[PDB]
mmCIF file of C-alpha atoms and ligand atoms in Angstrom:
data_model
loop_
_atom_site.group_PDB
_atom_site.id
_atom_site.type_symbol
_atom_site.label_atom_id
_atom_site.label_comp_id
_atom_site.label_asym_id
_atom_site.label_seq_id
_atom_site.Cartn_x
_atom_site.Cartn_y
_atom_site.Cartn_z
ATOM 1 C CA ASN A 1 -11.369 -3.572 -8.058
ATOM 2 C CA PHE A 2 -10.140 -0.266 -6.606
ATOM 3 C CA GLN A 3 -11.325 3.303 -6.181
ATOM 4 C CA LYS A 4 -8.542 5.620 -7.314
ATOM 5 C CA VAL A 5 -8.123 8.237 -4.602
ATOM 6 C CA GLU A 6 -5.311 10.446 -5.941
ATOM 7 C CA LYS A 7 -2.218 10.185 -8.129
ATOM 8 C CA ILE A 8 0.820 9.804 -5.884
ATOM 9 C CA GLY A 9 3.515 10.198 -8.526
ATOM 10 C CA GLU A 10 5.085 9.278 -11.854
ATOM 11 C CA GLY A 11 8.567 8.062 -12.813
ATOM 12 C CA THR A 12 9.159 6.906 -16.398
ATOM 13 C CA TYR A 13 8.427 3.324 -15.327
ATOM 14 C CA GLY A 14 4.751 3.936 -14.571
ATOM 15 C CA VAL A 15 2.178 5.840 -12.556
ATOM 16 C CA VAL A 16 1.372 5.350 -8.856
ATOM 17 C CA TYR A 17 -2.042 5.937 -7.288
ATOM 18 C CA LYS A 18 -3.423 6.033 -3.790
ATOM 19 C CA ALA A 19 -6.330 3.603 -4.001
ATOM 20 C CA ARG A 20 -8.895 1.990 -1.721
ATOM 21 C CA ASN A 21 -9.827 -1.667 -2.055
ATOM 22 C CA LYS A 22 -13.528 -1.513 -2.923
ATOM 23 C CA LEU A 23 -14.301 -4.582 -0.776
ATOM 24 C CA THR A 24 -11.874 -4.497 2.173
ATOM 25 C CA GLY A 25 -11.244 -0.776 2.532
ATOM 26 C CA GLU A 26 -7.451 -1.150 2.659
ATOM 27 C CA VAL A 27 -5.743 1.957 1.323
ATOM 28 C CA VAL A 28 -2.773 0.972 -0.827
ATOM 29 C CA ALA A 29 -0.312 2.403 -3.313
ATOM 30 C CA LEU A 30 -1.134 1.039 -6.763
ATOM 31 C CA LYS A 31 1.636 1.034 -9.373
ATOM 32 C CA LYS A 32 0.648 0.665 -13.045
ATOM 33 C CA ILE A 33 3.502 -0.234 -15.380
ATOM 34 C CA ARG A 34 2.996 -0.243 -19.151
ATOM 35 C CA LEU A 35 4.792 -2.957 -21.121
ATOM 36 C CA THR A 36 11.555 -14.668 -15.992
ATOM 37 C CA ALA A 37 10.408 -11.535 -14.191
ATOM 38 C CA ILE A 38 6.860 -12.449 -13.146
ATOM 39 C CA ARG A 39 8.054 -15.346 -10.992
ATOM 40 C CA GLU A 40 10.980 -13.703 -9.182
ATOM 41 C CA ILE A 41 9.103 -10.442 -8.577
ATOM 42 C CA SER A 42 6.311 -12.424 -6.953
ATOM 43 C CA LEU A 43 8.874 -14.014 -4.616
ATOM 44 C CA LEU A 44 9.264 -10.577 -3.025
ATOM 45 C CA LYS A 45 5.726 -10.695 -1.559
ATOM 46 C CA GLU A 46 6.989 -13.016 1.168
ATOM 47 C CA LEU A 47 10.417 -11.399 1.625
ATOM 48 C CA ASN A 48 9.830 -8.601 4.116
ATOM 49 C CA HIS A 49 11.703 -6.274 6.467
ATOM 50 C CA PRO A 50 10.529 -3.300 8.563
ATOM 51 C CA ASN A 51 12.591 -0.908 6.460
ATOM 52 C CA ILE A 52 11.340 -2.059 3.046
ATOM 53 C CA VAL A 53 7.948 -1.246 1.555
ATOM 54 C CA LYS A 54 5.742 -4.346 1.495
ATOM 55 C CA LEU A 55 4.657 -5.625 -1.941
ATOM 56 C CA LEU A 56 1.071 -6.797 -1.184
ATOM 57 C CA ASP A 57 0.183 -8.279 -4.609
ATOM 58 C CA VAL A 58 1.505 -8.625 -8.206
ATOM 59 C CA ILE A 59 -1.138 -8.685 -10.980
ATOM 60 C CA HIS A 60 -0.178 -9.340 -14.612
ATOM 61 C CA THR A 61 -3.289 -8.683 -16.692
ATOM 62 C CA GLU A 62 -3.597 -7.144 -20.178
ATOM 63 C CA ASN A 63 -0.361 -5.653 -21.587
ATOM 64 C CA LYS A 64 0.384 -3.989 -18.227
ATOM 65 C CA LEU A 65 1.881 -4.881 -14.846
ATOM 66 C CA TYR A 66 0.112 -3.791 -11.640
ATOM 67 C CA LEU A 67 1.992 -3.711 -8.323
ATOM 68 C CA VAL A 68 0.072 -3.241 -5.061
ATOM 69 C CA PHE A 69 2.183 -1.731 -2.279
ATOM 70 C CA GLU A 70 1.538 -0.696 1.275
ATOM 71 C CA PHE A 71 0.765 3.031 1.421
ATOM 72 C CA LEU A 72 2.692 5.611 3.448
ATOM 73 C CA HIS A 73 1.668 9.287 3.465
ATOM 74 C CA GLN A 74 5.098 10.963 3.224
ATOM 75 C CA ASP A 75 8.509 10.575 1.650
ATOM 76 C CA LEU A 76 11.919 11.957 2.544
ATOM 77 C CA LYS A 77 11.956 14.430 -0.339
ATOM 78 C CA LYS A 78 8.757 16.107 0.896
ATOM 79 C CA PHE A 79 10.002 16.020 4.496
ATOM 80 C CA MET A 80 13.327 17.596 3.497
ATOM 81 C CA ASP A 81 11.617 20.435 1.601
ATOM 82 C CA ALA A 82 9.301 21.044 4.557
ATOM 83 C CA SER A 83 12.369 21.106 6.828
ATOM 84 C CA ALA A 84 14.599 23.364 4.637
ATOM 85 C CA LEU A 85 14.558 26.433 6.967
ATOM 86 C CA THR A 86 15.004 24.503 10.258
ATOM 87 C CA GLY A 87 16.925 21.387 9.139
ATOM 88 C CA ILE A 88 16.255 17.810 10.210
ATOM 89 C CA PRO A 89 17.595 17.271 13.762
ATOM 90 C CA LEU A 90 20.726 15.141 13.788
ATOM 91 C CA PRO A 91 19.163 12.356 15.945
ATOM 92 C CA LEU A 92 16.482 11.869 13.292
ATOM 93 C CA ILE A 93 18.983 12.005 10.403
ATOM 94 C CA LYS A 94 20.963 9.350 12.289
ATOM 95 C CA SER A 95 17.911 7.150 12.915
ATOM 96 C CA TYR A 96 16.845 7.409 9.265
ATOM 97 C CA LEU A 97 20.348 6.557 8.011
ATOM 98 C CA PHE A 98 20.585 3.597 10.422
ATOM 99 C CA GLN A 99 17.193 2.237 9.331
ATOM 100 C CA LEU A 100 18.005 2.630 5.655
ATOM 101 C CA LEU A 101 21.269 0.764 6.155
ATOM 102 C CA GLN A 102 19.279 -1.959 7.933
ATOM 103 C CA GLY A 103 16.960 -2.169 4.925
ATOM 104 C CA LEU A 104 19.861 -2.327 2.473
ATOM 105 C CA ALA A 105 21.771 -4.922 4.479
ATOM 106 C CA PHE A 106 18.653 -7.090 4.402
ATOM 107 C CA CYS A 107 18.074 -6.882 0.665
ATOM 108 C CA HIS A 108 21.817 -7.038 -0.102
ATOM 109 C CA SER A 109 21.985 -10.171 2.078
ATOM 110 C CA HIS A 110 19.324 -11.640 -0.225
ATOM 111 C CA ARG A 111 21.408 -10.326 -3.145
ATOM 112 C CA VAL A 112 18.727 -7.832 -4.208
ATOM 113 C CA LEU A 113 19.877 -4.375 -5.387
ATOM 114 C CA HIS A 114 17.845 -1.176 -5.376
ATOM 115 C CA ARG A 115 19.886 0.627 -8.092
ATOM 116 C CA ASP A 116 17.888 3.870 -8.013
ATOM 117 C CA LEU A 117 17.786 5.266 -4.479
ATOM 118 C CA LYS A 118 16.594 8.849 -4.173
ATOM 119 C CA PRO A 119 14.836 10.898 -1.451
ATOM 120 C CA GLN A 120 11.426 10.684 -3.065
ATOM 121 C CA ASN A 121 11.619 6.854 -3.005
ATOM 122 C CA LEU A 122 12.121 6.783 0.799
ATOM 123 C CA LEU A 123 8.773 6.621 2.627
ATOM 124 C CA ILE A 124 8.292 7.743 6.246
ATOM 125 C CA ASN A 125 5.435 7.434 8.730
ATOM 126 C CA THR A 126 4.342 9.090 11.990
ATOM 127 C CA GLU A 127 6.119 6.403 14.034
ATOM 128 C CA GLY A 128 9.664 7.366 13.008
ATOM 129 C CA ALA A 129 10.029 4.612 10.398
ATOM 130 C CA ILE A 130 11.632 4.992 6.950
ATOM 131 C CA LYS A 131 11.311 2.424 4.173
ATOM 132 C CA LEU A 132 13.009 1.636 0.877
ATOM 133 C CA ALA A 133 10.544 1.974 -2.014
ATOM 134 C CA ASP A 134 10.416 2.098 -5.807
ATOM 135 C CA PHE A 135 13.186 -0.421 -6.380
ATOM 136 C CA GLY A 136 14.741 -0.152 -9.842
ATOM 137 C CA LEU A 137 14.195 -3.847 -10.524
ATOM 138 C CA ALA A 138 12.792 -3.512 -14.059
ATOM 139 C CA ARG A 139 16.049 -4.148 -15.926
ATOM 140 C CA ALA A 140 17.393 -6.708 -13.436
ATOM 141 C CA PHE A 141 14.265 -8.877 -13.643
ATOM 142 C CA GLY A 142 13.826 -8.246 -17.374
ATOM 143 C CA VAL A 143 10.418 -6.548 -17.426
ATOM 144 C CA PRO A 144 9.693 -4.991 -20.886
ATOM 145 C CA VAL A 145 8.864 -1.497 -19.631
ATOM 146 C CA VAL A 146 13.256 13.092 -16.743
ATOM 147 C CA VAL A 147 15.733 10.737 -15.066
ATOM 148 C CA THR A 148 17.500 11.967 -11.938
ATOM 149 C CA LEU A 149 21.220 11.209 -11.988
ATOM 150 C CA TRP A 150 22.143 12.994 -8.772
ATOM 151 C CA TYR A 151 22.504 9.796 -6.743
ATOM 152 C CA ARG A 152 24.141 7.541 -9.386
ATOM 153 C CA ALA A 153 27.367 5.768 -8.406
ATOM 154 C CA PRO A 154 30.441 6.607 -10.523
ATOM 155 C CA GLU A 155 30.871 3.004 -11.722
ATOM 156 C CA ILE A 156 27.364 3.147 -13.256
ATOM 157 C CA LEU A 157 28.089 6.482 -14.960
ATOM 158 C CA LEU A 158 31.370 5.097 -16.280
ATOM 159 C CA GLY A 159 29.516 2.264 -18.005
ATOM 160 C CA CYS A 160 30.119 -0.666 -15.674
ATOM 161 C CA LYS A 161 27.850 -3.448 -16.757
ATOM 162 C CA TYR A 162 28.188 -5.650 -13.663
ATOM 163 C CA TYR A 163 27.914 -3.323 -10.681
ATOM 164 C CA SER A 164 27.391 -4.394 -7.084
ATOM 165 C CA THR A 165 25.609 -3.635 -3.811
ATOM 166 C CA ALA A 166 28.121 -0.759 -3.536
ATOM 167 C CA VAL A 167 26.009 1.375 -5.897
ATOM 168 C CA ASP A 168 23.264 1.596 -3.238
ATOM 169 C CA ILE A 169 25.760 2.676 -0.577
ATOM 170 C CA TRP A 170 26.957 5.483 -2.830
ATOM 171 C CA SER A 171 23.391 6.671 -3.402
ATOM 172 C CA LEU A 172 22.634 6.550 0.333
ATOM 173 C CA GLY A 173 25.783 8.548 1.048
ATOM 174 C CA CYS A 174 24.558 11.276 -1.287
ATOM 175 C CA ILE A 175 21.196 11.297 0.515
ATOM 176 C CA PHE A 176 22.929 11.416 3.935
ATOM 177 C CA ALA A 177 24.895 14.492 2.795
ATOM 178 C CA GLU A 178 21.664 16.076 1.542
ATOM 179 C CA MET A 179 19.818 15.574 4.860
ATOM 180 C CA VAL A 180 22.767 17.173 6.658
ATOM 181 C CA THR A 181 23.304 20.170 4.396
ATOM 182 C CA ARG A 182 19.805 20.639 2.890
ATOM 183 C CA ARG A 183 21.345 20.781 -0.593
ATOM 184 C CA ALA A 184 21.786 18.013 -3.134
ATOM 185 C CA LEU A 185 25.478 17.031 -3.139
ATOM 186 C CA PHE A 186 25.881 16.326 -6.886
ATOM 187 C CA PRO A 187 22.956 17.795 -8.917
ATOM 188 C CA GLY A 188 24.106 16.917 -12.426
ATOM 189 C CA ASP A 189 21.979 17.399 -15.510
ATOM 190 C CA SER A 190 23.793 15.009 -17.863
ATOM 191 C CA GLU A 191 25.786 11.836 -17.345
ATOM 192 C CA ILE A 192 29.007 13.731 -17.996
ATOM 193 C CA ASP A 193 27.908 16.700 -15.891
ATOM 194 C CA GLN A 194 27.138 14.269 -13.065
ATOM 195 C CA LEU A 195 30.554 12.673 -13.428
ATOM 196 C CA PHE A 196 32.344 16.027 -13.481
ATOM 197 C CA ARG A 197 30.501 17.355 -10.418
ATOM 198 C CA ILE A 198 31.664 14.246 -8.539
ATOM 199 C CA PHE A 199 35.233 14.728 -9.811
ATOM 200 C CA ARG A 200 35.282 18.415 -8.891
ATOM 201 C CA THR A 201 34.502 17.489 -5.284
ATOM 202 C CA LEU A 202 36.210 14.123 -4.679
ATOM 203 C CA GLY A 203 38.993 14.520 -7.271
ATOM 204 C CA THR A 204 39.225 12.923 -10.698
ATOM 205 C CA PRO A 205 39.676 9.191 -9.937
ATOM 206 C CA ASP A 206 42.838 7.418 -11.130
ATOM 207 C CA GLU A 207 44.507 4.033 -10.714
ATOM 208 C CA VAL A 208 45.918 5.084 -7.329
ATOM 209 C CA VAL A 209 42.536 5.318 -5.604
ATOM 210 C CA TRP A 210 40.482 3.117 -7.982
ATOM 211 C CA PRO A 211 42.450 0.314 -9.671
ATOM 212 C CA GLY A 212 41.061 -0.398 -13.124
ATOM 213 C CA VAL A 213 39.092 2.859 -13.371
ATOM 214 C CA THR A 214 41.010 3.867 -16.522
ATOM 215 C CA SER A 215 39.913 0.651 -18.243
ATOM 216 C CA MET A 216 36.214 1.241 -17.676
ATOM 217 C CA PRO A 217 33.860 1.381 -20.695
ATOM 218 C CA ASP A 218 33.210 5.157 -20.701
ATOM 219 C CA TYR A 219 36.420 6.325 -19.049
ATOM 220 C CA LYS A 220 38.288 8.849 -21.205
ATOM 221 C CA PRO A 221 41.973 9.697 -20.615
ATOM 222 C CA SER A 222 40.933 13.205 -21.626
ATOM 223 C CA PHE A 223 38.808 13.709 -18.476
ATOM 224 C CA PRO A 224 40.020 16.870 -16.710
ATOM 225 C CA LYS A 225 42.141 16.135 -13.633
ATOM 226 C CA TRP A 226 40.546 17.921 -10.667
ATOM 227 C CA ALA A 227 42.245 17.880 -7.269
ATOM 228 C CA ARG A 228 40.236 16.436 -4.411
ATOM 229 C CA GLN A 229 38.989 19.345 -2.294
ATOM 230 C CA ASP A 230 39.233 18.998 1.456
ATOM 231 C CA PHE A 231 36.366 16.910 2.804
ATOM 232 C CA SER A 232 35.653 19.566 5.478
ATOM 233 C CA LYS A 233 33.774 21.579 2.838
ATOM 234 C CA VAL A 234 31.457 18.689 1.944
ATOM 235 C CA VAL A 235 29.017 18.367 4.853
ATOM 236 C CA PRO A 236 30.524 21.088 7.062
ATOM 237 C CA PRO A 237 28.523 21.031 10.298
ATOM 238 C CA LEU A 238 28.670 17.250 10.669
ATOM 239 C CA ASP A 239 30.992 15.836 13.352
ATOM 240 C CA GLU A 240 34.010 13.677 12.516
ATOM 241 C CA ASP A 241 32.094 10.428 13.180
ATOM 242 C CA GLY A 242 29.524 11.434 10.562
ATOM 243 C CA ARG A 243 32.121 12.724 8.089
ATOM 244 C CA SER A 244 34.204 9.563 8.522
ATOM 245 C CA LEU A 245 31.214 7.362 7.761
ATOM 246 C CA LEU A 246 30.254 9.494 4.751
ATOM 247 C CA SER A 247 33.785 9.367 3.333
ATOM 248 C CA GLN A 248 33.684 5.556 3.452
ATOM 249 C CA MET A 249 30.277 5.599 1.775
ATOM 250 C CA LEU A 250 31.673 7.773 -1.027
ATOM 251 C CA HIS A 251 34.839 5.794 -1.763
ATOM 252 C CA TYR A 252 35.451 5.691 -5.500
ATOM 253 C CA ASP A 253 36.537 2.050 -5.445
ATOM 254 C CA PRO A 254 33.429 -0.162 -4.997
ATOM 255 C CA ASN A 255 35.685 -2.743 -3.341
ATOM 256 C CA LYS A 256 36.678 -0.210 -0.720
ATOM 257 C CA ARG A 257 33.232 1.369 -0.270
ATOM 258 C CA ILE A 258 31.776 0.368 3.094
ATOM 259 C CA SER A 259 29.037 -2.269 3.148
ATOM 260 C CA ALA A 260 25.640 -1.675 4.716
ATOM 261 C CA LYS A 261 26.409 -4.318 7.339
ATOM 262 C CA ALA A 262 29.749 -2.785 8.285
ATOM 263 C CA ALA A 263 28.298 0.739 8.272
ATOM 264 C CA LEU A 264 25.796 -0.325 10.947
ATOM 265 C CA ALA A 265 28.775 -0.937 13.246
ATOM 266 C CA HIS A 266 30.348 2.484 12.594
ATOM 267 C CA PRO A 267 30.876 4.624 15.750
ATOM 268 C CA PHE A 268 28.525 7.287 14.359
ATOM 269 C CA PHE A 269 25.626 5.029 15.435
ATOM 270 C CA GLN A 270 26.809 4.499 19.036
ATOM 271 C CA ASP A 271 24.169 6.926 20.399
ATOM 272 C CA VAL A 272 21.473 6.126 17.836
ATOM 273 C CA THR A 273 17.843 6.581 18.904
ATOM 274 C CA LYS A 274 14.479 6.527 17.120
ATOM 275 C CA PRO A 275 12.909 10.001 17.274
ATOM 276 C CA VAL A 276 9.463 10.717 15.858
ATOM 277 C CA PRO A 277 9.157 13.237 13.005
ATOM 278 C CA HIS A 278 6.574 15.954 13.054
ATOM 279 C CA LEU A 279 4.545 15.315 9.917
ATOM 280 C CA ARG A 280 1.789 17.376 8.336
ATOM 281 C CA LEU A 281 -0.442 15.042 6.341
HETATM 282 O O1 8IQ B 1 9.403 -1.114 -5.873
HETATM 283 C C1 8IQ B 1 9.046 -1.394 -7.048
HETATM 284 O O2 8IQ B 1 8.483 -0.509 -7.727
HETATM 285 C C2 8IQ B 1 9.310 -2.792 -7.591
HETATM 286 C C3 8IQ B 1 9.310 -3.106 -8.952
HETATM 287 C C4 8IQ B 1 9.568 -4.430 -9.353
HETATM 288 O O3 8IQ B 1 9.607 -4.903 -10.699
HETATM 289 C C5 8IQ B 1 9.252 -4.025 -11.735
HETATM 290 F F1 8IQ B 1 9.246 -4.666 -12.906
HETATM 291 F F2 8IQ B 1 10.163 -3.046 -11.775
HETATM 292 F F3 8IQ B 1 8.023 -3.579 -11.516
HETATM 293 C C6 8IQ B 1 9.830 -5.406 -8.417
HETATM 294 C C7 8IQ B 1 9.825 -5.100 -7.079
HETATM 295 C C8 8IQ B 1 9.572 -3.809 -6.676
HETATM 296 N N1 8IQ B 1 9.603 -3.576 -5.251
HETATM 297 C C9 8IQ B 1 10.184 -4.606 -4.410
HETATM 298 C C10 8IQ B 1 9.964 -4.231 -2.933
HETATM 299 C C11 8IQ B 1 10.387 -5.375 -2.007
HETATM 300 C C12 8IQ B 1 9.553 -6.149 -1.200
HETATM 301 N N2 8IQ B 1 10.304 -7.027 -0.542
HETATM 302 C C13 8IQ B 1 11.606 -6.909 -0.883
HETATM 303 C C14 8IQ B 1 12.752 -7.606 -0.455
HETATM 304 C C15 8IQ B 1 14.015 -7.264 -0.956
HETATM 305 C C16 8IQ B 1 14.128 -6.230 -1.888
HETATM 306 C C17 8IQ B 1 12.988 -5.526 -2.307
HETATM 307 C C18 8IQ B 1 11.725 -5.874 -1.801
#
């Protein structure tokens, strides 16, 4: 049905190809996934937002699951690498953050979580748009399907079984910091190394800042107690509006962590514009 054009990427869920519909000529991103889900997934075809990748078609044939997505040429990881020596201009960082919060507020309003946000899942086009892609919906929908931990919320790493929309805010805060500084904020290589990198920067959490943290499934009283280091070291250049918003995105307590909807009203976005990136395809 399709002419494979190139392999776009991997991820231990499946493989993604750029492909051309043999009959219509549409170029699409084709996701092959080896194996109540089929129904609720398919609902997403008609649930759409400018800052979410469009799921064109869902095809369950054989012992595999094919997902046909709209194709975009670039992602934020590639753009950030290409911008490492210059840095992404603040107005574009701001526009991207704003759009991603719009995308999250939409899918959170429909009670859909992403769960696995990372730069390489954020697609961008020549028109200044950025879109949520590669949702981690396998577990949530119950599909019978090396992992990056750098953007995982602390409640996930501490074994919370029933985590909330707040996990996506945490991940987006880590990406925000990375656009600003051009370095991953918390590049852990194990679940405990990820946790300890977070603690070394934001302080070991306790019941004062995060009620109930000490009762969490993987919390150990033996965790080292790091002081919180001053937040001025975290994303240095960024102005106080940006730092303020980031600090609310990185609150330990998911109940205190800012929502996508409230973050859209933060003063950091008072002068928000939509610049156009300069993309080499
Ligand atoms: O992005 C993927 O890879 C993916 C995998 C899925 O199930 C799995 F089993 F994992 F394959 C299911 C959906 C997926 N994307 C959904 C994108 C989407 C369109 N409209 C939406 C409205 C609100 C929230 C999200 C969306």
